Amino acid sequence: ILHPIDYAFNEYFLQHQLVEPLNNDIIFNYIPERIRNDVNYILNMDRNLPSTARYIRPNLLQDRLNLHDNFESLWDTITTSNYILARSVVPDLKELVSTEAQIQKMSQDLQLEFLTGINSQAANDCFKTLIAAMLSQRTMSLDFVTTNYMSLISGMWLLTVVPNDMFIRESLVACQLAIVNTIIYVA
């Protein structure tokens, strides 16, 4: 027994519920496709879903405000947050080369009549920074000392493997100019 208006509200609620049937097929499709096809991960549906199982599917419509167009501050914050999350989820490297042995060989080869900042902490930090910056599309600037031609040698590989649009243009041109004018044109 309801007023017509109350009945309208309740009827709308009853007729437009957000719950939908859930099955192993829906769960499997919810798993990202690339992960499903990757042979490194074995996925099994070891659970039985009764017929009376429901779920509310997320609303994953792509952004309607286009915060990447003319929202510099908001986009900077968004990219920073995604970068933090990606850093959290990137794995940690294991059994790196012995830092002391590598430092000793580098010092012997370079014969510095440079080796500062080389260690496992820095290696892991760089791994995470690269992967997370690529995931979040955070622009990453390059910090280096032009006198450290070893750092420039490493930056050669950096630029080879990391797309050039991931670096702020000034930093990219600085690194490339240092490389050319201290190694390549000189050689």
Partner 1 sequence: MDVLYSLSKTLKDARDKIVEGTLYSNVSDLIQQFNQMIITMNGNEFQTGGIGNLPIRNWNFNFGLLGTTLLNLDANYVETARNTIDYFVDFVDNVCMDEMVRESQRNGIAPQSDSLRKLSAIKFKRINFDNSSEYIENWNLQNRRQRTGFTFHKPNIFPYSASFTLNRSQPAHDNLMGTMWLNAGSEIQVAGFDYSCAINAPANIQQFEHIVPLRRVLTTATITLLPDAERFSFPRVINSADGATTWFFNPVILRPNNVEVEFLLNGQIINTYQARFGTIVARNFDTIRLSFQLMRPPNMTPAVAVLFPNAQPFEHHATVGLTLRIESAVCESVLADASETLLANVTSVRQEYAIPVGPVFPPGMNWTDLITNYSPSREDNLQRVFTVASIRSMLIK
Partner 2 sequence: QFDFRNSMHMLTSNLTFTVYSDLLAFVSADTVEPINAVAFDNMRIMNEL
Partner 3 sequence: KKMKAIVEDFLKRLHIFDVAVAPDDQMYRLRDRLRLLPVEVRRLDIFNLILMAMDQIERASDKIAQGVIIAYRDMQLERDEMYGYVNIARNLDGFQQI
d(CA 100, CA 141) in angstroms, rounded, equals 29
- The candidate with the shortest Cα–Cα distance to 144, out of 160, 135, 155, is 155
The entry of partner 1, partner 2, partner 3, none near residue 108 (CB within 5 to 8 angstroms by kind) is: none
Question: Interface with partner 1 includes 62 (CB under 8 A)?
Answer: yes
Residue 71 in the binding site for partner 3 (CB under 8 A)? yes
The count of residues interacting with partner 3 (CB under 8 A) is 16
Q: Is 156 within 8 Å of 98 (Cβ atoms)?
A: no
- Interacting residue with partner 3 among 34, 47, 64, 94 (CB under 8 A): 64
Examine residue 42 and tell whether it contacts partner 1 (CB under 8 A). no
Min dist CB 163 to partner 2, Å, is 17
Q: Of 9, 25, 53, 93, which lies in the binding site for partner 2, with binding defined by CB under 8 A?
A: 53
In this structure, are residues 118 and 103 in contact, taking their beta carbons and an 8 Å threshold?
yes
Q: Using CB under 8 A, which of the segments 71-79, 98-106, 112-120, 124-132 binds partner 3? A: 71-79
Report the SS3 class of residue 122: helix
> Of 88, 68, 91, 89, which Cα lies nearest the Cα of 139?
68
**162 with 134: CB under 8 angstroms?**
yes
Residue whose token pair is 């600037």:
141
- Rg of the chain, C-alpha, whole Å: 27
Q: Is 88 in the site for partner 3 (CB under 8 A)?
A: no
Considering the complex, what minimum distance in angstroms separates the CB of residue 187 from partner 2? 28
* Residues forming the site for partner 3 (CB under 8 A): 5, 8-9, 12, 16, 64-66, 70-74, 77-78, 81
